[PDB]
Structure formats: C-alpha cells, structure tokens
Structure 1
Amino acid sequence: GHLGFLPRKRAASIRARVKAFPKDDRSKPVALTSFLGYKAGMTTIVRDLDRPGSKFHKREVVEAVTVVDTPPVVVVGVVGYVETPRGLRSLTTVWAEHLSDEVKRRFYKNWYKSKKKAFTKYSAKYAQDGAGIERELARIKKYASVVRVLVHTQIRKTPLAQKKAHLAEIQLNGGSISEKVDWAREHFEKTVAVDSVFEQNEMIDAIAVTKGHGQRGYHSRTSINHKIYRVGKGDDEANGATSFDRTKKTITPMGGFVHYGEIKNDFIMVKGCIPGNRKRIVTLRKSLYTNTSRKALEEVSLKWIDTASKFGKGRFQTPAEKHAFMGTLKKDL
C-alpha cells in the first residue's frame, strides 16, 4: 500500500478541500485559478492521434473520457489574504450585497424550521452609501497580498434533490491586487462561464472524494495531467456538433445519465476518469503548470461519442433506430 496515501480515514465532507494554488502570476491578466463543478457519469470518445512516432500515429484511437456537470459559477464575494510569520491569514471577508436562497441554505440544516434569518442585516449595512462595506475594499487594497474570490454553484440547475449551495474560494491569477479586488467587486453577482477561465486542450487537474464501497473509499484524492478535449455547453442543444458525425444529438445518454446526472447545464470533457462517482462535487484547476510534452501540448479533435444506455448491457443508440426490423408493433403503432 502507498505510504503517502495513509491513513485511509474518510474525508470530512463531500467537497474536496483545495490547499494549493498555481503560485501567483503578477503579469497575467486577472483570471480564476480554478473552477468548480459536479461529476456526472462517463462516456467514450475517439480522436486522431497527431503524436509523432506513436504506434497509432495519424490514426483514429478510442479514449475513455468522463463528463463533469458544470453549473455556471456566480460570484458572491471575495476574500483577501496577508502574509504573516504564522502563515497565510484571511484579514477580511466580503459578500456581493445579495445572496440567493441556495447560498443561505448552506448555513442551515433545519432551514424550513428556522426563521430564515440568513444574510439580511448584513445587506442592511450594504443598503446605504457603503461606508464600512466600501472601506473594506480600501482596507484589502492597502494590505492584501493574494486575493481569493468567493463563488457558489447553481445547484438548483443541477438535477439534484439537494438545493443547498456549494461554495469555495478561488485564487485570482492576475497581479496588482488592487486590480484583483476591483475585478472581483465588478463581478459581484455576475455569472462566469467555462470559456472565461479554461480552454480546449488545457491540462487541468481534478480533485474530489473517492467512491465509497460501503474503511475503504470516500477519501479526498488529487489527479493531475488531465487534458480537456472540448468545452461543453449543455445549456444549448446539439452538443455533439463536431466536425464529424453530422447527425447532431445530445451528450445525454438514452434515458438520461445512468443513476443520476441528466445534463441540463454547462459541461466539460476531460481525458480519463475522475476520482469519485456521480453526485460528487469536483473542483478543477490548471495543474500548476503546463507540460511541454506532445501528450500535454498537442491539440485533439473529436468524433464518435457513445450514446447507448447502460441500464443493462446497452444496444439502442437513439429511439428512431427501432423500426424496419421489428415489423408491426400494435402496442405502439
């Protein structure tokens, strides 16, 4: 057994705690250092191997790729940090004036029984000329060194019975922390898309809690060197609008995703599998730095995508395939 991955004690929460960020680039424009989303099932994808010298070089090759259910990231605040001899410390936290019901639920377990006195008087302080809630920005500018944005996911968009919001801190790539806080404030209550941070062929890393076998499993894990193959937009239609297979369909498997994960929002395709099963929230990061190897730098296309259901063994790809061979079906037509 691995010595580093011991003891095997289970994680304390579904969300995996991120404790490392890709340094701090003082020259890059302001951008998010990571992304948050939810994990769906898995599928299959094939692409052309442009890698030189490979056995399957310049040939179509099948690769296993998972699908991450990514809801839009709506900013709710930002957190500043200051260097100290006792380690990094969060000097001040601020919020985006207004908070959705899902965000308020995160602070409540018996939400229905509670009088729902969530963020309210704080908004009353904001409901004026600003003063303290505006001087906090100046205080952050004066002393802060690294600023982490505070965002939550649109859980109600995800097909999850649990409507409680999930929130985590994300560091800002850009320098000039004044610009960091200015951009964060301007983005208060705004919605951020995947294209604003990640991009196709980027070697992102995945971190999440492992599957529980029902103590084996249910522990946080980090997987690095995973290449994105296509930015997905499940809000629209015809997600399979690739250059090949001009018979546009949807990435959703027949009858919906197995067990759970009926995609109804943005999604992303990532090379290989991801730790943990569906219904688990997964955070994405740029993998610190980008390797210069062809396996990490080369860009890839996409073609065949499997759509047959897995509620059994799998056969039918689309409902329109059932005709001709079955003759008459008086029960239906």
Structure 2
Amino acid sequence: GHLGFLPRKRAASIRARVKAFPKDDRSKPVALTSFLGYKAGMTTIVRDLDRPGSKFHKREVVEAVTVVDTPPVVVVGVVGYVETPRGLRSLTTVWAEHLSDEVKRRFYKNWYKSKKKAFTKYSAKYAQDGAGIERELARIKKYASVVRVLVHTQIRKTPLAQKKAHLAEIQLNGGSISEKVDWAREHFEKTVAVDSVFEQNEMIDAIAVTKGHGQRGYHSRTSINHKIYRVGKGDDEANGATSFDRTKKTITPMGGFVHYGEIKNDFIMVKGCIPGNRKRIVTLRKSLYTNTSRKALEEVSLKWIDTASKFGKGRFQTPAEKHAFMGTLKKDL
C-alpha cells in the first residue's frame, strides 16, 4: 500500500479539519474561504460536453455527481492569530452574545441534565456600550496576521436528528485586518448564504472522514479539484428543472434520498464522489490557488437531472409520472 497515508488510524472526530487555507489577495475585499455541509447520496447527470479539442466535443455525456446538503451558516465569533517563531498562536477569540441552542449544545456532552448556563456571564460582559468586548476586538485589530471566523451548522433546518451544531474555523482572505474584523463585527449572528461562497462551474476541494468498516477505514481524506455543477436554493421551487428540461421537480428523488431526507434548503452538486458517506459532515475549501486548465475554464450546460428513486429501481421521475403511466388503481377509486 501507499506509505504517505500513515499512520492509517482513526480520525480525531466525525468532523475532519481543514489542514491548509487559501493564501491571500490583498486587493480583494473580505471573503470567506470555505463552507460546510452534509453528504446526501449520489445522482446521475447528463450534459453536452462543450470541451474543445475533444473526442466527446458537443456530444451528450453521462456522469455520477454527489449532492451535499449545505444550509446557510451562522457566525458566532471571530479569532486573531499572531505569527510566532513557533508558528501561530491564537491570542484572542471573541464571540457574539446571542448564541443558539444548537451552538451551546456543542459545549455540553450531556445537554439534558445541564442547567444550560453557558455563555451567560460572558453575555453580561457584552451588556454595555462595549468596553471589554470592543477592547478584545482592538486587540486583534492591532496584532495578528490571519483572522478566522467561528461558525456553526444550522442543524434544525437539516433532516438529521443529531441536533448538535458543528463548530468549524474558517479564515478570511480579504485584504487588510482592519477590514477583516469590521466585516466580522457586522456579520455576528447573521446567517451566511452558500451561493455567496461558491458559484457554478468552479473547482473546489472537499474534506470528509471516510466510510468506516470494521483497523481499516475512518480516516480524514481531502480530495482536490472537483467541479461544482449546481448551486441550488431552497426557496426556489424546481431545482431539478434545467434550462432544457424545465419540468417542475426537485433534485430529491421520490421519497427522499437514500437514508437521507428531503432537501428543503440550499445544496451543492459536485462532480464525482466526495469521500465518506451520507450524513457525514463535509467542509468545502476553495482550492488554494488558481488552476487555469481547460478542465477548469469550461462553463457547463446541464441538460437533465435524474430524480428517479434509487431505493430499489426508478422507472419514473415525479409522482405525476406514476399515474400518467399506470392510469388509476384500486385504492384511488
């Protein structure tokens, strides 16, 4: 086997962590660098390949893509790390007062017995014009090279019963640290959209903990360069409808995904297969650099999204496709 993947041992968490972060462009205004979500099955996809110089130029091409449930995500804190001779050293993190039940729940292993007294005497540290709070912001604003944001999943929106929000650090590649903080100041408690991190037709890498078996498996793996096909939004009906097909249907197959629910909010559709399995948390980073290849230049024209039920077999797409073929039966009339 491969030597570099040693020790082949258990990951620390269900949530694998972003080892690297994208560099910096100081000319840009402030931008997030990554985003989190949950793996949700595999779907078949067809489109015409507008790749020049190709043996499959302009022809129809069929490929399996994974959909990842990515809800809008909420800031609860900002962090400042100083550069040291010894690397990096978070000198201060600072939070946002109005924390949700989901975030607080991350601070208790036993939520039921608890007196739920968590960010409380810290919330009374907030209760004034600022003073102590605005001090610790100025602390960061003075020193510290990289400014990272504390955020958590909106898991109540999720069709998962795990109920306990995941915390993940995501840094900021917007230039000047004065801007960095004065972007995190305004964006405390505010929910952050998925389409405001990634567009369609983009290369991204993904992180996830791998499908455990019986030691074998259950390692953190990062795959690199994967094209986002579709960014959909939960408020817009007909996600399955392309510019071609245009029949009103959701990307969710008839009766939800395999061991995963209805997709009642925003999602990402990524080329090929993300590591791990459905339910697992994945964090998507924006590829560290600019990989200008014709593999990355092409803007895709999706044709049709296979929304057949993968549980068992799928001969049809919508419930409207069952009774147009069957007609009408016993229990109906």
TM-score w.r.t. structure 2 length? 0.97
Q: CA deviation at 1:327?
A: 5.6
Measure how far apart 1:297 and its partner are. Answer: 1.3
Distance change in 2, residues 1:82/1:313 (3 Å): same
Give the match's secondary structure for 2:185: helix
User: Which whole-Å deviations, capped at 9, do the CAs of 1:76-114 have from their partners, x for residues lacking one?
Assistant: 111111100111110100111211000000011211101
- Cα RMSD between the aligned structures? 1.3
Query: Is the Cα contact below 8 Å between 1:77 and 1:185 reproduced in 2?
Result: no
Structure 1 counterpart of 2:313: 313
Q: Which runs of 5+ in 2 are unaligned?
A: none
Cα distance change on mapping 1:325 and 1:300 into 2, 3 Å: closer
Corresponding residue of 2:266 = 266
Q: Secondary structure of the residue that 1:123 maps to in structure 2?
A: coil
Q: Please state how far the C-alpha of 1:253 moved relative to its aligned partner.
A: 0.7
Cα separation, partners in 2 of 1:38 and 1:323, compared to 1, 3 Å: closer
Distance of 2:110 and 2:20 partners within structure 1: 33
Structure 1's 182 and 273: CA in aligned 2 closer, same or farther, altered over 3 A?
A: same
* Residues 51 and 57, structure 2, Cα contact 8 Å, conserved in 1: yes
Equivalent pair of 2:80/2:140 in contact (CA under 8 Å): yes
1:241 positional shift: 3.3
The 8 Å contact of residues 74 and 192 in structure 1, kept in 2 or not, is answered as: yes
Cα distance, 1:311 vs structure 2: 1.6
Aligned-pair CA distance for 1:7: 2.2
Deviation per CA, 1:45-67: give whole Å up to 9, x if none.
11121111211111121121100
Residues 16, 325 of structure 1: alpha-carbon distance in 2 compared, 3 angstrom cutoff: closer
Three-state SS of the structure 2 residue aligned to 1:126 is: coil
Deviation at residue 236 of structure 1 after TM alignment: 2.8
Could you report, residue by residue, the CA deviation over 1:272-300 in whole angstroms, capped at 9, with x for unpaired residues?
Answer: 11001011010001111121111111110
- Relative to structure 1, the CA distance from residue 325 to residue 33 in structure 2 (aligned partners, 3 Å threshold; closer, same or farther) is closer
Report the Cα distance in structure 1 between the residues aligned to 2:39 and 2:323, rounded to whole angstroms. 35
Sort the Cα spacing of 1:327 and 1:144 in 2 relative to 1 into closer, same or farther, 3 A.
closer
How has the CA–CA distance of structure 1 residues 95 and 247 changed in structure 2, closer, same or farther, with 3 Å as cutoff? same
Matches within 5 A, 1:153-302: 153-302=153-302
Residues 325 and 50 (structure 1 numbering): CA distance in 2 closer, same or farther, change over 3 Å? closer
**Displacement of 1:323 after TM fit?**
3.4
Q: Say which is worse superposed, 228-237 or 57-66, in terms of deviation.
A: 228-237
- Aligned partners of 1:175, 1:321: CA distance in 2, in Å? 52
Matches of 1:87 and 1:186 in 2, distance apart? Answer: 29
Say how many residue pairs are matched.
Answer: 333
Deviates more, 1:203-212 or 1:2-11: 2-11
Following the alignment from structure 2 to structure 1, what is the Cα–Cα distance between the partners of residues 70 and 329? 40
**Aligned equivalents of 2:137, 2:326: Cα separation in 1:** 69
The DSSP-based 3-state class of the residue aligned with 2:324 is: coil
Contact 1:261 1:279 in 2 (8 A): no
C-alpha deviation, 1:328, in angstroms = 5.2
Distance 2:285 2:172 in 1: 12
Which residue of structure 2 lines up, in the alignment, with residue 75 of structure 1? 75
Deviations 1:177-225 (A, max 9, x none): 0100000111111111122221111101001001112322111000111
Whole-angstrom CA distance in 2 between matches of 1:322 and 1:72: 34
Cα 1:114/1:329, change in 2 over 3 Å: same
Query: Normalised by the size of structure 1, how large is the TM-score?
Result: 0.97
Give me the whole-angstrom Cα distance separating, in 1, the residues matched to 2:325 and 2:157.
40
Change (3 A) 1:314 1:213: farther
**What's the CA shift for 1:325?**
5.2
CA distance in 2 between partners of 1:294 and 1:324 (Å): 43
Q: Residue 46 of structure 2 aligns to a residue in which SS?
A: strand
Compare 320-329 and 102-111 and name the one that shifted more: 320-329
Shift of 1:313: 2.8
| Native 8 Å contact 2:71 2:194 kept in 1 | no
* Structure 1 residues 215-251: Cα deviation after superposition (integer angstroms, max 9, x where no partner): 2211100011101112111243111232111212001
* CA–CA distance in structure 2, aligned partners of residues 108 and 45 of structure 1: 42
Relative distance call for 1:297 and 1:324 in structure 2 (3 A) is: closer
CA contact (8 A) 1:79 1:149 kept: yes
> In the TM superposition, what is the alpha-carbon distance from 1:316 to its structure 2 partner?
2.8
Paired residues of 2:208 and 2:220 also in contact (CA < 8 A): yes
Instruction: Determine if contact 1:261/1:278 at 8 Å carries over to the other structure.
Output: no
Which blocks of at least 5 consecutive residues in structure 1 are unaligned?
Answer: none
2:7 aligned residue: 7
SS in 2 for 1:137: helix
User: Residues 328 and 300 of structure 1: is their aligned pair in 2 closer, same or farther, counting only changes over 3 Å?
Assistant: closer
CA distance in structure 1 between the partners assigned to 2:324 and 2:248 by the alignment = 22
- More displaced, 46-55 or 218-227? 46-55
Q: SS of the residue aligned with 2:125? A: helix
